[PDB]
Ligand binder design. Structure first.
Ligand SMILES: NNC(=O)c1ccc(N)c(N)c1
Length: 165
């Protein structure tokens, strides 16, 4: 009944930075929210723990969740390799939005991005499923290690992750 909350403890070249928490909109996109929740807890035997944010573009977004190829070409969901676009009820309204990365229609896996700006051109193309609840300061700090082309100057990792409450 209560939307679940998940957390990521972020490190920069192995050094703790801080924690980002997210509210997952299970009330509006339950199947997508559940995939991210389970990847965050690792309860299916695979997930986000130890993965990195491989592409960070200041003023745009930080992208991660590729735990099979570590570069933006991999990932898999709890439902199989890919899963469908659940719905496009929620929009990319500004910094803090959590949304699914994809490679075309109906190709969601495990990759996700956190908006650091409004990305309205993505509406109806990428499934929005959550928002940052605490630690937008930590996202902003992360963002400073990106670049115009997305390559990061230090390695930004999810050192730990899980479910709160
Ligand atoms: N778009 N480039 C990719 O290789 C890719 C990007 C996102 C994904 N979820 C998957 N599976 C692949």
């Amino acid at each position: 009944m209560v939307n679940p909350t998940v957390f990521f403890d972020i490190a920069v070249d192995g050094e703790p930075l801080g924690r980002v928490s997210f509210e997952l909109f299970a009330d509006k996109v339950p199947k997508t929210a559940e995939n991210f929740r389970a990847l965050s807890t690792g309860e299916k035997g695979f997930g986000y723990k130890g993965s990195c944010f491989h592409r960070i573009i200041p003023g745009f977004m930080c992208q991660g969740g590729d735990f099979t190829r570590h570069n933006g070409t991999g990932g898999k969901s709890i439902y199989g390799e890919k899963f469908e676009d659940e719905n496009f009820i929620l929009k990319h309204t500004g910094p803090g939005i959590l949304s699914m990365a994809n490679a075309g229609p109906n190709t969601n896996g495990s990759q996700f991005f956190i908006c650091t700006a409004k990305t309205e051109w993505l509406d109806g193309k990428h499934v929005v499923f959550g928002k940052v609840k605490e630690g937008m300061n930590i996202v902003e700090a992360m963002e400073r290690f990106g670049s115009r082309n997305g390559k990061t100057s230090k390695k930004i990792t999810i050192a730990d992750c899980g479910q709160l409450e």
